[PDB]
Design brief:
Blueprint lengths: L6 H6 L5 E6 L4 H12 L9 E2 L19 E6 L12 H7 L10 E7 L9 H12 L3 E2 L4 E3 L5 H20 L10 E5 L32 E10 L8 E7 L12 E4 L5 H10 L7 E6 L14 E2 H8 L8 H8 L5 H8 L6 H13 L4 H7 L7 H7 L6 E4 L10 E7 L2 E3 L5 E3 L1 H8 L7 E7 L13 E4 L5 H17 L6 E7 L9 H10 L4 E6 L9 H7 L1 H9 L4 E7 L3 H16 L4 H12 L4 E6 L1
Parallel strand pairs: 1-2, 1-3, 3-4, 4-5, 4-6, 18-19, 18-21, 19-20, 21-22
Antiparallel strand pairs: 7-11, 8-9, 8-17, 9-14, 10-13, 10-17, 11-12, 15-16
Helix pairs in contact: 6-7, 6-11, 8-9, 16-18, 18-19
The structure holds flavin-adenine dinucleotide (FAD), NADP nicotinamide-adenine-dinucleotide phosphate and flavin mononucleotide (FMN).
The site of NADP nicotinamide-adenine-dinucleotide phosphate has 19 residues, from strand 19, helix 16, strand 21 and helix 18.
Length: 609
C-alpha cells in the first residue's frame, strides 16, 4: 500500500496548518474529518482530511515546523476494541515508536458505539498515547456514540472545539465554497464512461483477480428463496456462485456486497429537481492540489451516481442541510434548514426528531420543503458514498467451496416521516432472480469467528433470529468433520424465533443435522408461542449445570451472533450467573472469568445492529 509523500510538506506547499485523519470503515469518521477540515476556513486557517494509511505518521514530529499547526484524529473502534483496517498501521507505530512529539498540538474525536464494551478504545488510546510521546492535547477527548446520536455528540464537540482552537491560536471567525467543478461531456464515447464499477473502468465486465473491496467479483445468484413460512416479514436464503474467482474463505467470515439504489427513488429525485439524469458528467476537485480528484468514479451519468455511488436513503447530516438552505426560496424553510446545524434549542430538536427520528432521506426533505430546489451537481457533491453491506457466510467452504451463502432479513419499515423506507441491500438482494444471469458484486472479509482448531472441543452456539447465519456454516462443517471420520465433541445450538410456523429459519436442514447427530442438542426458544417471552438465555439458564461442565472442564468455545442491542448483553449476563453459581464466586469474579474467555478466544462474537 504505497505511501504518499510527507503530509507535512503537502501542507507547507498548500498553505495548510491543520490536518484531520480518519479511522473510518463505513464512512462516518471520514465525513466528520472532511467537515472538520472544511471548517478551518471560518478562522483564516486551511485544513485537509487524510487517510492515515496512505501516509507516514512518523512525520508528526515535523508538524511543529508549520505555524499554528494542529492535527485532529477521528478514529473509530471495531470488534474487541481494535483499530479500523485503515488505522491498523498507525496503531502499531504508536505501539513501537518513542519519537518526541514535543510541539505537536492535537485533538481526538472518537467514533464508538456506546453499547459496546471498549467504548472508543481506539480514540482513547490515541488521545492518551500522543500525550506520552510529548504532544499537547488542545481540546478534551471527544467520545461520540452511535447508539444515541453520534451526529449530535459530534456537533456538541464541534461547537466547543473550534472556539478553543481559535482562542488558543488567537484568531477570529471570518459562503458556500464548493469542492468540485462540474464538467458536462456531450459526445463522449460510451466505452469510457463508468456505469457502476467501483474501480478501474470496465472492471465489472472484464473480471480479473485478485478480488477485493476495490475490485469486487460479480458472482451469479444461484438460489434466492423465502425461508420463513409466515408472511409478517421476509427472511431469505441466497447462494452466490464464486466459481473461478480464486476467492477463499472460511465459515465465520463475512461477505460484502455493493448494492444498487431503488430505480424509482433515483427517478423521483431527478424528477423533483427537474434534471436529466442521463447527462454524462464529471466532478473534479477545484483544488488542483488534492488527492481526491473526483467524489466518485467519473465520467458517469447522474443516474449512475445516484444508483451505485451515492447514499440517498439515510438521513442527511446537518452540514448537508445547512449547505442546502441557500436553495430554499421560501424564507421560513431556509431558516429551518439553517437551524438544523444549531447545537441547542429547538434547532437541535427539529433535527433529531424531524430528520433522524422520522428517518427522512434526501428525497423526503425535498418533498416536505417544496421551495428547496438545489442544483443536481452541487447536491451530488454533498451526499455521502454508498457503503457496502456485510453478511455472515452461512456455509462452510469445506462443503460449498465454490459457493457463498447468505441469511438475511429484508428491511422494510414505517418511518414517522410517514412513508415506507426500504433497506438498500436487502431490497436489491431480494429482487435478484436465479434467472435460469443475476450478478452480485462482492468480496470476502476474513474474521476471527472460528470454530475450534481441535475438532474434539465442545461448541456452544447462541444465535437467535438472523444470528443463525454463521452457525449454519459451522454446523455444516462439524457435520462434515464427523463424516470424514474425525472425533467431534458436543455441538449445542441455542436458537430462537417468534413462532415455529412463522419464522423458524432452516427448520428442515437443522432437523436433519440433529437426526444425523451433528447437533448434540437443538434448543429452540419460540418467544411468541406463549404469553410470556422465552428466549435463548432462558434456555442457557435452564442448562446451566451442563454448560458449566463444558466450559470449566470441557474447554468449550462460546459463540454469540445476531442482535447486538440486547439479546447478547442478556446472554452475556446469563453466562455471568452460570459462572457465579457453579464456580462458585462473587459476581465480580464471574465477570472476570468470562472476560478472560473472550481474550483467550473461547468466547466469540458476531453481532450487529
Ligand atoms: C458484521 C456484520 C454482519 C452482518 N451479518 C448479517 C447477516 O448475516 N444477516 C443479516 O440479515 N444482516 C447482517 N448484517 C446487517 C447488514 O449488514 C445490513 O445492515 C442489513 O442487511 C440491512 O441492509 P440494507 O442496506 O437493506 O438496510 P439499510 O438501507 O442500510 O437500512 C438500515 C437502517 O434502517 C434503519 N431501520 C431499520 N428498521 C428500522 C425501523 N424499524 N425503525 C427505524 N429505523 C429502522 C436503521 O438505521 C438501520 O440501521 C450484518 C452487519 C454487519 C456489519
Ligand atoms: N430496532 C431497529 O431499529 C433495528 C434496526 C435494524 C435492525 N434491527 C435488528 O435486526 C434484526 C432483524 O430481525 P432478526 O430476524 O435478526 O431478529 P428477530 O426476529 O427480531 O428476533 C429473533 C428472536 O430473538 C428474540 N429476542 C428479542 N429480544 C431478545 C433478547 N433481548 N434476548 C434474546 N432474544 C431476544 C425475538 O423475540 P421477540 O421479537 O418476540 O421479542 C425472536 O424470538 C433484529 O435484531 C432487529 O432488532 C433493529
Ligand atoms: C462489526 C462492528 C463492530 C463494532 N465494534 C465496535 C467496538 O468494539 N467498539 C465501538 O465503540 N464501536 C464498535 N462499532 C461501532 C463503530 O465503532 C461505530 O459505528 C462507528 O460509527 C463506525 O464508524 P465508521 O463508519 O467510520 O466505521 C462496531 C461496528 C460494527 C459494524
Amino acid at each position: 500500500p504505497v505511501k504518499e509523500s510527507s503530509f507535512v510538506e503537502k501542507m507547507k506547499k498548500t498553505g495548510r496548518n491543520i490536518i484531520v485523519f480518519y479511522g473510518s470503515q463505513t464512512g462516518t469518521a471520514e465525513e466528520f474529518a472532511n467537515r472538520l477540515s472544511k471548517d478551518a476556513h471560518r478562522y483564516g486557517m486551511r485544513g485537509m482530511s487524510a487517510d492515515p494509511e496512505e501516509y507516514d505518521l512518523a512525520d508528526l514530529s515535523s508538524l511543529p515546523e508549520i505555524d499554528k499547526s494542529l492535527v485532529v484524529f477521528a478514529m473509530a473502534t471495531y470488534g474487541e476494541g481494535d483499530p479500523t483496517d485503515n488505522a491498523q498501521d498507525f496503531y502499531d507505530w504508536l505501539q513501537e515508536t518513542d519519537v518526541d512529539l514535543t510541539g505537536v498540538k492535537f485533538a481526538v474525536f472518537g467514533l464508538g458505539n456506546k453499547c459496546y464494551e471498549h467504548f472508543n478504545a481506539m480514540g482513547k488510546y490515541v488521545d492518551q498515547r500522543l500525550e506520552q510521546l510529548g504532544a499537547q492535547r488542545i481540546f478534551e477527548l471527544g467520545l461520540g456514540d452511535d447508539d444515541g446520536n453520534l451526529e449530535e455528540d459530534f456537533i456538541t464537540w464541534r461547537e466547543q472545539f473550534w472556539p478553543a482552537v481559535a482562542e488558543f491560536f488567537g484568531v477570529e471567525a471570518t459562503s458556500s465554497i464548493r469542492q468540485y467543478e462540474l464538467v458536462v461531456h456531450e459526445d463522449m464515447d460510451v466505452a469510457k464512461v463508468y456505469t457502476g464499477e467501483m474501480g478501474r473502468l470496465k472492471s465489472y465486465e472484464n473480471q480479473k483477480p485478485p478480488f477485493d473491496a476495490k475490485n469486487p467479483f460479480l458472482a451469479a445468484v444461484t438460489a434466492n428463496r423465502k425461508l420463513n413460512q409466515g408472511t409478517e416479514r421476509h427472511l431469505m436464503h441466497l447462494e452466490l456462485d464464486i466459481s473461478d474467482s480464486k476467492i477463499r474463505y472460511e465459515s465465520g467470515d463475512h461477505v460484502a456486497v455493493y448494492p444498487a439504489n431503488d430505480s424509482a427513488l433515483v427517478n423521483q429525485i431527478g424528477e423533483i429537481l427537474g434534471a436529466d439524469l442521463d447527462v454524462i458528467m464529471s466532478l473534479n476537485n477545484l483544488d488542483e492540489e488534492s488527492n481526491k480528484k473526483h467524489p466518485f468514479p467519473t465520467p458517469t451519468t447522474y443516474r449512475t451516481a445516484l444508483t451505485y455511488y451515492l447514499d440517498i436513503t439515510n438521513p442527511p447530516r446537518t452540514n448537508v442541510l445547512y449547505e442546502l438552505a441557500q436553495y430554499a426560496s421560501e424564507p421560513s424553510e431556509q431558516e429551518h434548514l439553517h437551524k438544523m446545524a444549531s447545537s441547542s434549542g429547538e434547532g437541535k430538536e427539529l433535527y433529531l426528531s424531524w430528520v433522524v427520528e422520522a428517518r427522512r432521506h434526501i428525497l423526503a426533505i425535498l418533498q416536505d420543503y417544496p421551495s428547496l430546489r438545489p442544483p443536481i451537481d452541487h447536491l451530488l457533491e454533498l451526499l455521502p458514498r454508498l457503503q457496502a453491506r456485510y453478511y455472515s457466510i452461512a456455509s462452510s467452504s469445506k462443503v460449498h467451496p465454490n459457493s457463498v451463502h447468505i441469511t438475511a432479513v429484508a428491511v422494510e419499515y414505517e418511518a414517522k416521516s410517514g412513508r415506507v423506507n426500504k433497506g438498500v441491500a436487502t431490497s436489491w438482494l431480494r429482487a435478484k432472480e436465479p434467472a435460469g444471469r443475476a450478478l452480485v458484486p462482492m468480496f470476502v472479509r476474513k474474521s476471527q469467528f472460528r470454530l475450534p482448531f481441535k475438532s474434539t472441543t465442545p461448541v456452544i452456539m447462541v444465535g437467535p433470529g438472523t444470528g443463525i447465519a454463521p452457525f449454519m456454516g459451522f454446523i455444516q462443517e462439524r457435520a462434515w468433520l464427523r463424516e470424514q471420520g474425525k472425533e467431534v465433541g458436543e455441538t449445542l445450538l441455542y436458537y430462537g424465533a417468534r413462532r415455529s410456523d412463522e419464522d423458524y429459519l432452516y427448520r428442515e436442514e437443522l432437523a436433519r443435522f440433529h437426526k444425523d447427530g451433528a447437533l448434540t442438542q437443538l434448543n429452540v426458544a419460540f418467544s411468541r408461542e406463549q404469553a410470556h417471552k422465552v428466549y435463548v438465555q432462558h434456555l442457557l439458564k435452564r442448562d446451566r449445570e451442563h454448560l458449566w461442565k463444558l466450559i470449566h472442564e470441557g474447554g468449550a468455545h462460546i459463540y454469540v451472533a445476531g442482535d447486538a442491542r440486547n439479546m447478547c448483553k442478556d446472554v452475556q449476563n446469563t453466562f455471568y450467573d452460570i459462572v457465579a453459581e457453579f464456580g462458585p464466586m462473587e459476581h465480580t469474579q464471574a465477570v472476570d472469568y468470562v472476560k478472560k474467555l473472550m481474550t483467550k478466544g473461547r468466547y466469540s462474537l458476531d453481532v450487529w445492529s
